[PDB]
């Protein structure tokens, strides 16, 4: 995990070039690249606090997409202005196999819109709950993709801050695509916002300490646990009870967890930041070289050459049978511009 021969130089050169591409778009973001009338709105794929994600059809090409719609007035009430500007500026700038692609973005009097690739295989969440738990090889396959994705994101000084099965989509090749960058932030050094999802919060977030990218590696610990066990390492009926368990310093593993898996998780679900994997001298390499990952070919994962554990059912284009049904609502567009100044850069 400490060795710096030639494989680490290939990684470095890849990341150097990736940062070059990212910064060009970070500094000159794409803006106003489509219009609502160019899309036919089909079905709601999911919901969130300030809006919904809808399956749409692009009229000129006939391509399907997932369009995230945010009500500007609701974003403001929930004080998510800057986070929403973060989300779009970051998503239009990144490029990685396991990140959902932003194809267009635009706004009107009422809403903000982010039009992303449609990922037809459904949320990992749906599959995980239905099957119960994933086998360790199954969980390892998904986990490896998140490891490379965080290596990418962190090298760009990004923190993701909302890892959970609800935000991971399975594509037609059986690989992962990360969605929802609502809390992603570009920051060098500490930040302090209390945000994320209760089950996945690192102790330092709960305790208002100021934190960094190590919270993503803690969340990875939670994700792997939840994939392999079928339930999260810290659960209860109320968030406050969840936080008490998280800060307590105690975790217990199912008896079917392998010795290697438990050792990896003890190092990820580590309250002591000076000991948490991903946050040490060797960076992500402490994770990549842990023997739970000994069978993982990292390059093969990146190239999508590894055989996926399962391939979602696909009933032709536009099919949503891998997604839950949601109540449909009208996209109303006011005749007056709302919150113009606040979202001018969107």
């Amino acid at each position: 995990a400490a060795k710096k021969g030639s494989e680490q130089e290939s990684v470095k050169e890849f990341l150097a070039k990736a940062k070059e591409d990212f910064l060009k778009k970070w500094e000159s973001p794409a803006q106003n690249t489509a219009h609502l009338d160019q899309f036919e709105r089909i079905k709601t794929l999911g919901t969130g606090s300030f809006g919904r994600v809808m399956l749409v059809k692009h009229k000129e090409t006939g391509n399907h997409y997932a369009m995230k719609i945010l009500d500007k007035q609701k974003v403001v009430k929930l004080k998510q202005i800057e986070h929403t500007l973060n989300e779009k500026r970051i998503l239009q700038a990144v490029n990685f196999p396991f990140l959902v692609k932003l194809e267009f973005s635009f706004k009107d009097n009422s809403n903000l819109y982010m039009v992303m690739e449609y990922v037809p295989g459904g949320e990992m969440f749906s599959h995980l709950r239905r099957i119960g738990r994933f086998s360790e090889p199954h969980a390892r396959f998904y986990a490896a993709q998140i490891v490379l994705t965080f290596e990418y994101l962190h090298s760009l000084d990004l923190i993701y801050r909302d890892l959970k099965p609800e935000n991971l989509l399975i594509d037609q090749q059986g690989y992962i695509q990360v969605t929802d960058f609502g809390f992603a932030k570009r920051v060098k050094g500490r930040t302090w916002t209390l945000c994320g999802t209760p089950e996945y919060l690192a102790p330092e977030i709960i305790l208002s300490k100021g934190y960094n990218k190590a919270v993503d590696w803690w969340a990875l610990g939670v994700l792997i646990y939840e994939m392999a066990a079928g339930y999260p390492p810290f659960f209860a009926d109320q968030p406050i009870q969840i936080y008490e368990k998280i800060v307590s310093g105690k975790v217990r593993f199912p008896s079917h967890f392998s010795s290697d898996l438990k050792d990896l998780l003890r190092n990820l679900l580590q309250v002591d930041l000076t000991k948490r994997f991903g946050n040490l001298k060797n960076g992500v390499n402490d994770i990549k070289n842990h023997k739970w990952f000994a069978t993982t070919d990292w390059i093969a994962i990146y190239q999508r050459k590894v055989e996926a554990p399962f391939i979602p059912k696909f009933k032709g284009p536009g099919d949503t049978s891998n997604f839950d049904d949601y109540e449909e609502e009208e996209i109303r567009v006011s005749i007056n511009e709302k919150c113009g100044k606040e979202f001018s850069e969107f």
Partner: peptide
Amino acid sequence: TTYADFIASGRTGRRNAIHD
């Protein structure tokens, strides 16, 4: 079992993000 305890809990559905 821990699994049964999870399944009977109020948080097996989609979990919302928190803020503030």
